[PDB]
Amino acid sequence: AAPESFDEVYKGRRIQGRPAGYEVFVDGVQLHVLRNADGSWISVVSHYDPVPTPRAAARAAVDELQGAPLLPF
């Protein structure tokens, strides 16, 4: 079953998540994310490093980006 949606400003950027399997956005641009069999998550900008939730993946993405806009997949 689907994680809950979220909306927050993290390190000056708007991160959003919502069930779709699940979509994440950074300042309105979609961040591709994948759920692993054990329920952890990764994103295209941290693809080898599982984190527990989609919001954690969004925050890991904002940390990685260091202010840079995301490019639409």
Binding site: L34, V44, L71
Partner: protein
């Protein structure tokens, strides 16, 4: 074709490898490798079709991907072969791999930008084109996101696992393939990607030429595992949904199966590969 430990290359071999990589970049061919990898890593899922990652074909898929890349390098300079990075042995930021005459070093702390070596953005010779964000310069943070590379003892513990892979044939599996890939256990291959940081930690990880060196050593470990376990072989072997079985063909090529890629000696050998022993 002999694949050599990077640490052993002569100055001439390093020169020739770097030049051939930069010519593939200049001609446009390099970036299509980056794109192919990103498409597979974004599509390969634990619950659905999976070919290049989180699945038994992780190893033959990367073997054939590296073969395509090495063949393209050889079309530029027939003397060049893919070197491998034994990250269990060459494990510090001071390894010669990371020197200015080979791949350059770690990224500066402000923006992770690599400042030296032939792939530094400042050279004008290594634009990051296939990317998931605006930044167009090679980035790395060696040892930044995870403290240490795997050790030989850790590698050995994984080499000792007798089953190639196990149901459910995904990132939750027990078995050699998933321990080498790193989703379970002490974590070998995924941890190295994380340790390099920068693009190497992302779906467009082939943007960093160390990608090839890492996967060439992962590929070597598969060969070491086979020598350790001559009685063990690829699985599954028939009728597995969403998973590439032994005699099924693999995307994107379609014209090759895992069965065709189990014996690397049809394509290249290594500088050293211990024979089966006890």
């Amino acid at each position: 074709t002999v694949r050599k430990n990077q640490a052993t290359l002569t100055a001439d071999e390093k020169r020739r490898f770097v030049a051939a990589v930069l010519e593939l970049k200049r001609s446009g061919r390099y970036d299509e490798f980056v794109r192919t990898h990103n498409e597979f890593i974004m599509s390969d899922t634990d619950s659905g079709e999976r070919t290049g990652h989180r699945s038994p074909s992780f190893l033959p898929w990367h073997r054939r991907f590296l073969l395509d890349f090495e063949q393209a390098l050889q079309s530029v300079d027939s003397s060049v072969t893919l070197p491998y990075w034994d990250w269990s042995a060459d494990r510090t930021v001071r390894a010669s791999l990371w020197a200015p005459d080979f791949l350059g070093g770690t990224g500066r702390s402000t923006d992770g930008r690599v400042m030296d070596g032939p792939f530094a953005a400042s050279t004008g010779n290594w634009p990051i084109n296939v990317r998931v964000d605006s930044r167009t310069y090679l980035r790395r943070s060696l040892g930044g996101s995870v403290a240490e590379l795997p050790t030989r003892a850790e590698v050995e513990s994984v080499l000792a696992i007798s089953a190639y892979d196990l149901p459910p044939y995904n990132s939750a599996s027990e078995g050699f393939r998933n321990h080498l890939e790193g989703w379970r256990g002490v974590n070998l291959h995924n941890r190295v990607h994380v340790w390099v940081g920068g693009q190497m930690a992302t779906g467009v990880s082939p943007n960093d030429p160390v990608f090839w060196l890492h996967h060439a050593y992962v590929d070597k470990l598969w060969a070491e595992w086979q020598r350790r376990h001559p009685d063990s072989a690829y699985v599954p072997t028939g009728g597995t949904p969403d998973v590439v079985d032994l005699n099924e063909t693999m995307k994107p090529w379609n014209t090759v199966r895992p069965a065709d890629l189990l014996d690397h000696t049809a394509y290249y050998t290594f500088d050293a590969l211990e024979h089966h022993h006890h």
